[PDB]
Amino acid sequence: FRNNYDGDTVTFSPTGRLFQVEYALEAIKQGSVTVGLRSNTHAVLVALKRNADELSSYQKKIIKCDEHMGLSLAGLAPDARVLSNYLRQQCNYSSLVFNRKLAVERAGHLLCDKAQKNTQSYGGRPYGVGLLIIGYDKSGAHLLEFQPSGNVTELYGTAIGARSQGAKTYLERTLDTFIKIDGNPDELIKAGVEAISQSLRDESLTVDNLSIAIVGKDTPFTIYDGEAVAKYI
Amino acid sequence: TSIMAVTFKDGVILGADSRTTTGAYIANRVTDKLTRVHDKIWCCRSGSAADTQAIADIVQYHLELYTSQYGTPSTETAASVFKELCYENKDNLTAGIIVAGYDDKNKGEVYTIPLGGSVHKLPYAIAGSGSTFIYGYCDKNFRENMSKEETVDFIKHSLSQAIKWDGSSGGVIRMVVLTAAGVERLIFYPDEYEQL
């Protein structure tokens, strides 16, 4: 089985699977955890940064695509750079040509389509990274989950990476609670920091270990690192 | 060159003179300016003989392949194909085309594609150097839903005036009747129309 069908993405298994893609999805789980949750006014991204030594920095995991959109990564950093950069252009295009801010639902469509192209042709490899996209457009706050398989989904909240299932349950239970945290950003951010620690195990989120990003009604997607997140640790 | 297409009660008729000139010399006095692109879709050609012929041939090609896959094309589709060629290549063409066809659902239709490459659907249309002289006569004598003989007469008189004044037009008046009944070829010699 598998052995003979995971040579490349252009091959289907007898059961009907695409192993190369599943292996890609695997690199995601092996990646550090990150969480996403939104209300009706804001959307927040909380991510756990990872480091090699104690002399090394913690790999950033939040990327800003435009003024009303951004995302968090889990997996291969390079691929997130490629994808966020492709999304940065798509936003820039929409602004220049149509003088319009790109709908978060449409950003997801573009990502899905770019990722799919890499799973049907010989020679290329699927992207090995997962993305959580937040953004406040013309129809409110939004949160999306991107899978290298090309599957993008709109949620109220979610998490991806190692032990990500902890936060995902906390949130699936805390739903009715944060979905109403409108008008107040500090509550969504605290709720986010909580859901994320549900997936901890090794250490406790420190200052240069935590990373939070937010966007909303009157908040242009901004990133918080270090001392900036101290008041949430 | 004098050409026109008129829509009447039963369908539509196309008429033209038969003179093509190169300067003041009449290169061909029995020219057939009424070109068939489909069974019941025809056209009147004015402008560069070389250009309109090449355009017509390409259109006939496109409609034949359209038919092979999607059945009989609408008269509007044929006009669309002509427009596509004429507009996209306006800088290298000198073609004035009148597209006339007969559909069973739409009866008779007439589209005019002037130099620019724009399309205009009308009850009837005239074109060619000789047309200028009959704008008055035509606007005064055209009536919607005339009979076949009424129309063949409206056209015979109009072109006879056009041939009269315009030295670029002349020869015989040709016509092509497009109705559910089929396709009919009419011809009218000098001795007849010169006396109208």
């Binding site: - | 093509t20 061909n28 020219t31 003989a49 070389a50 090449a54």
Partner: protein
């Protein structure tokens, strides 16, 4: 150049003069303006001689290949479509003006093609600087249902009109008859109404008249 084409009851005939010029000077006193496209499709060409020769042979070549591929006789309408789409492509820069005729499994045909790619159909046609002299004769003596010999006469007469009245045309008359059932018969120099009268003297020089400075044998063999 004067080239004509005349249709008759069972075929078609084409003729042309033989004067090739360069400005006001005769380049060839007897060039052939009748070109073979296939055994039974012949072409008369006016305009730029190199172009009528070239365009005529190119299509002829492709027609031969097409014929071999389809196992069928070449059709005049095929040589016509190929010729015009080629001439049209070159927007008139290939100065070829042709009268193409012939017989094939579908009857006898007569067409004309202008450098820009337009084509005309008719029972009688003419092209070239002699075009008008010839057409004047055709408009005066043509009639429907000519016999093979009546056509050859009319055609021959039209070319003469040109040879005599047009300075661009002269010398001899070449004809080529294509009949629905028989072989195409090419008649090179069917008429030669312009033979040079014997010179008034011989200019043969007494050997040694020309002063030579040096001489030698030329090596040809390797």
């Amino acid at each position: 150049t004067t080239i004509v084409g005349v249709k008759f009851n069972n075929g078609v005939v084409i003729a042309a003069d033989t004067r090739s010029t360069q400005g006001p000077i005769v380049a060839d006193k007897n060039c052939a303006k009748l070109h073979r496209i296939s055994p039974k499709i012949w072409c008369a060409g006016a305009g730029t001689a190199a172009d009528t020769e070239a365009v005529t042979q190119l299509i002829g070549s492709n027609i031969e290949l097409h014929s071999l591929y389809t196992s069928r006789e070449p059709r005049v309408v095929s040589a016509l479509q190929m010729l015009k789409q080629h001439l049209f492509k070159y927007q008139g820069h290939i100065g070829a003006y042709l009268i193409v005729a012939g017989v094939d499994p579908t009857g006898s045909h007569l067409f004309s093609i202008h450098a820009h790619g337009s084509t005309d159909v008719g029972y009688y046609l003419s092209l070239g600087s002699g075009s008008l002299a010839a057409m004047a004769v055709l408009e005066s003596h043509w009639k429907q249902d000519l016999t093979k010999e009546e056509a050859i006469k009319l055609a021959s007469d039209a070319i003469q009109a040109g040879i005599w009245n047009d300075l661009g045309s002269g010398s001899n008359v070449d004809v080529c008859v294509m009949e629905i059932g028989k072989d195409a018969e090419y008649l090179r120099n069917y008429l030669t109404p312009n033979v040079r009268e014997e010179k008034q003297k011989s200019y043969k020089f007494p050997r040694g008249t020309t002063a030579v400075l040096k001489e030698s044998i030329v090596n040809i063999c390797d």
